[PDB]
């Protein structure tokens, strides 16, 4: 029922080979809806979902402006961090940033985020109170003093508590048929002989949205973790997700095992048992 809005920005320096590579993506829950890539032809924020296309020219120009300013600040930022960590111009470096908010099913504000990383490690983060920072080291403490002096937290908090939640609620209404749908997983079980004493049972959950799902094995109505495998949730490529779970069972005892499936799209949990 709960909803999220996320913007991920990545900036990779490519010494000699030119200006840094910049990539920005926008998500509403598990669905990507916008993109910006510095290497692309357009030089614009681009739609990635059919719903967001309905937005006017002022929105697309303001989104282009804000994302271009981000990529350009990252180029200055990549140079400044080389200065702070006394690093060479020969090596490749990455800047990562996450911005976004969380709303409840009723639409109320739950949480705001602003976090930055340098080379896969935490640099600086806005705390949950949206009023203080956490700096990962001495270099991130130079940035902290600047941001505290310039009142960066107050501007961010105003964007998160205002702007972020209003646009998300708007996306959820305009993108309702995709964003708020709860595609129940289509389920099935497969069977494979391992030896003539042991067999593998595989429990499948396909075409589900959102990505959150619980798949569990039971032996005679009791929790089974031993001789089990669970793959991480994967995109099918068309907006839906996939998952499977397996158990290695003794031959002839297949009927004793059940696979329990839990998803938002199911009114009651489904139980699967081999024939």
């Amino acid at each position: 029922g709960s909803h999220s809005m996320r913007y991920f920005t990545t900036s990779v320096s490519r010494p000699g080979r030119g200006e840094p590579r910049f990539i920005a993506v926008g998500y509403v829950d598990d669905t990507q809806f916008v993109r910006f890539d510095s290497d692309a032809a357009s030089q614009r924020m681009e739609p990635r979902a059919p719903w967001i296309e309905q937005e006017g020219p002022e929105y697309w120009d303001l989104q282009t402006r804000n994302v271009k300013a981000q990529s350009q600040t990252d180029r200055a930022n990549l140079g400044t961090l080389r200065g702070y960590y006394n690093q060479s111009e020969a090596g490749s470096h990455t800047i990562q940033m996450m911005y976004g908010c969380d709303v409840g099913s009723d639409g109320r504000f739950l949480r705001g985020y602003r976090q930055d990383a340098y080379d896969g490690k935490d640099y600086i983060a806005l705390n949950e109170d949206l009023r203080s920072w956490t700096a990962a080291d001495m270099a991130a403490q130079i940035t902290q003093r600047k941001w505290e002096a310039a009142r960066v937290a107050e501007q961010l908090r105003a964007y998160l508590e205002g702007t972020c939640v209003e646009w998300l609620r708007r996306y959820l209404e305009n993108g309702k048929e995709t964003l708020q749908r709860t595609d129940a997983p289509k389920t099935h079980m497969t069977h494979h002989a391992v030896s003539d004493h042991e067999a593998t049972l595989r429990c499948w959950a396909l075409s589900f949205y959102p990505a959150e799902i619980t798949l569990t094995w039971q032996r005679d109505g009791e929790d089974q973790t031993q001789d089990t495998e669970l793959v991480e949730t994967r995109p099918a490529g068309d907006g839906t997700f996939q998952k499977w779970a397996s158990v290695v069972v003794p031959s002839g005892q297949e009927q004793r095992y059940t696979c329990h499936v839990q998803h938002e799209g199911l009114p009651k949990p489904l139980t699967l048992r081999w024939e």
Partner: peptide, 9 residues
């Protein structure tokens, strides 16, 4: 909506 948030380090 991604707001203008170009802060320098």
């Amino acid at each position: 909506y991604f707001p203008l948030q170009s802060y320098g380090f």
